[PDB]
Structure 1
C-alpha cells in the first residue's frame, strides 16, 4: 500500500503558545484508535482548522495506490491514480528525527517521529508499534482529510 501510519485525530488545542505565524497554525491533537499525540503545522490560510475538529491523518511513503516509489520531483502532468485524490490537505516532507524512551539496555516502548514539510513541522509520538514505518531522512506525505 505504501502507508506508514493511519489514524483519526481530534484537534484538542490550536497555538497553545500563541499565534507565531499568520498563515501557519500549530495543532495539538490526539487520536482515539491508537492514543498518539500529534503536533502539526498547517497552512490555515488555505486549509483552515478549528478547535475540536476531527480529521483522518495518513502518513504515507508514496501517493500512488500501487506500491511504487517516488522521485521527489514535481510532476503535475501525472495521470496515475494518486491517493491524494481522497484527501483535502496534503503535504510532502521528510523525517528528520526519531526519539524514544529507550535505555542503554531496553528498547523503546514509545517513539516520537519528527517530520518537516518544507519547514512546517510535525511530531507524531506514541507507541513504538505504530511508528515502525518511520526512518530518519525518509520522504513521506501527510494526506489529511477533515470529517464530520
Structure 2
C-alpha cells in the first residue's frame, strides 16, 4: 500500500534495441550519486527521451488504505481511487533477484512481464524492497 521506494531519476540513455515498442533506459538519481536504474519501458504508451526527470516509485499495492496477485485483476470502475491516479506509467512485476554489488550497494531485479528493471543503490533506502510483487509508478 505505502511507498516502498521513491526517488527522482535523470534518464541518461535510451536504447531501442531490436524492438519497436520497448526501450531500455539508463537513469541515475538526481539526489544520490549511487542509486541508478535500468528499466524497460513501453515507449509507445509512455515516450521517454534522454535527459528526462522521472519520478520513480515502487509500492506494494495501489490502494490508498494500508495493507490488511492472488486476487483476480478487475477493470477499474468509475470512481475507483488508486495510487496510479497520481502517476502516468504503472507496471506490475515480480522481484526475482537480490544481488549484492558491493559492501554498500544492493541491486534489486524486477520483471514486469518480461520488461526488466535493475534498481541499484545503497541498502538503507532499498531495504523496504523484499522478494514479493510490486507496482512501479513513473511520472514525468
| Same-fold status (TM-score > 0.5) | yes
Structure 1: gaps spanning 5 or more residues: 103-107
| Residue 44 of structure 2 corresponds to residue 45 of structure 1 | yes
Residue in 2 aligned with 1:85? 85
1:14-56: per-residue Cα shift (whole Å, max 9, x none)? 11xx622111000000012233110000001111101111110
Residue in 2 aligned with 1:105? none
Instruction: Provide the aligned length of Structure 1 versus Structure 2.
Output: 138
| Bigger proportion of residues as strand | 2
Residue in 1 aligned with 2:139? 145
| Residue 122 of structure 2 corresponds to residue 127 of structure 1 | yes
Written as runs of structure 1 = structure 2, the 5 A alignment for 1:1-148 is 2-15=2-15, 19-35=17-33, 36-68=35-67, 71-78=70-77, 79-101=79-101, 108-136=103-131, 138-146=132-140
Q: State the TM-score, normalizing by the size of structure 1.
A: 0.85
Could you say what secondary structure the match of 1:67 adopts?
coil
Q: Kindly indicate whether the alpha-carbon contact (under 8 Å) linking 1:8 and 1:55 is maintained by their aligned counterparts in 2.
A: yes
Q: State the TM-score, normalizing by the size of structure 2.
A: 0.90
Shift of 1:72: 4.8
Distance in 2 between residues matched to 1:88 and 1:5, nearest whole Å: 17
CA RMSD of aligned residues (A): 1.8
Structure 2: gaps spanning 5 or more residues: none
